[PDB]
């Protein structure tokens with residue numbers, strides 16, 4: 001009645017042996033956790049990274065948030081509180097809201113009340129929160145190299161579960177991306193307060209994410225398995241269509257608060273958890289999630305991409321094209337960069353990249369045959385990776401070009417991808433040029449190097 005908590009998501013308590021390698025561990029739990037979209041991970045009892053900060057010296061710009069179900073909110077893009085003054089505001093807010101010690105309010109009650117207040121139009125509750133990547137003003141909650149570190153800190157510098165490391169690690173396919181994608185490869189820092197909330201979303205390029213709660217009151221999560229992503233979006237579009245009006249940029253993606261009971265009513269499977277200090281939440285590819293903080297806290301989260309994700313990554317970019325949605329990076333560029341580094345690639349990585357590359361090459365072969373039959377005859381090699389991203393998006397579908405594109409002297413600087421040859425200009429196709437990064441004869445040896453490395 002009124003609010004029925006979703007069933008609990010899986011919770012894992014790995015031994016230190018199981019825990020040591022996060023990528024091995026994530027791969028192990030995948031058959032279970034991809035069915036629920038999110039899962040929780042409790043590290044071994046003595047895995048205890050040191051949390052130490054001067055609350056008077058850490059400062060950040062607060063963002064403001066109204067809390068209305070189905071109301072459009074904008075995805076965060078990369079006034080002032082110190083961590084102390086924010087904490088004081090946060091604690092007083094919760095304490096005053098409930099007239100209870102800021103810290104004796106049941107999680108069940110805060111959850112019940114959250115879903116009441118967002119549904120009630122008469123209530124006009126606004127809260128504040130922090131969200132940004134690490135900076136000199138507010139750095140990672142994990143140890144980073146710089147300052148003389150304690151031995152305790154040195155211990156956790158190179159941990160696989162130190163989220164600063166997760167990007168640059170071997171089994172992380174986003175590592176070799178030479179592109180500047182700060183928003184994606186770097187951890188985000190999240191100072192929370194009671195009710196401050198993250199709207200339903202999936203990660204860019206359907207990547208994984210992992211979220212660590214450094215300290216404070218719990219974070220309440222709702223998660224949906226990747227297999228039900230389109231079900232959820234259909235429910236969303238029926239109840240909040242304005243969210244789906246085509247977004248002009250990557251800086252105007254619209255998201256919203258929605259009661260999980262509403263999804264469950266529409267046969268969307270939803271799972272929940274309360275993440276407490278010292279615990280991880282992991283989200284799987286295309287797994288929708290949302291949630292809110294129980295009180296003053298501090299979390300850190302990062303995207304990552306395992307070899308498992310590679311085929312989904314390709315599918316995601318296809319899906320972005322259909323939606324005319326901007327890409328954070330070129331998937332094909334990433335694949336070719338790894339192929340060009342085949343000799344230093346992890347061997348399982350090499351094997352999986354090889355498979356995606358084969359698909360890429362066969363798709364590219366067919367697209368080029370199609371545009372040749374449309375009367376495009378001239379061609380010239382073009383180093384797409386040198387162009388700023390906004391200078392190599394398809395005019396029509398906004399995909400980031402890399403393997404090839406069509407240009408015309410008529411429309412200087414404009415490009416279309418090979419799916420949209422007819423969308424560039426009114427000139428006849430013999431005026432067009434196929435701009436390509438690699439010939440098919442360049443590509444097969446690159447793929448062969450991967451095969452040799454994979455043995």
Ligand SMILES: O=C(O)C[C@@H]1C(=O)Nc2ccc(F)cc21
Pocket residue numbers: 076131190197198199201209210211219289299301
């Ligand atoms: O990992 C998460 O998605 C949750 C994370 C979080 O703790 N707060 C917040 C705010 C906006 C976001 F887009 C994402 C988040």
Ligand SMILES: [Cl-]
Pocket residue numbers: 067068069117118119120121122123124125
């Ligand atoms: Cl409200």
Ligand SMILES: [Mn+2]
Pocket residue numbers: 201202203209283289
């Ligand atoms: Mn997320």
Ligand SMILES: [Zn+2]
Pocket residue numbers: 321394395396397398399416417418419420
């Ligand atoms: Zn296109």
Ligand SMILES: [Zn+2]
Pocket residue numbers: 408409410411425426427431
């Ligand atoms: Zn033209």
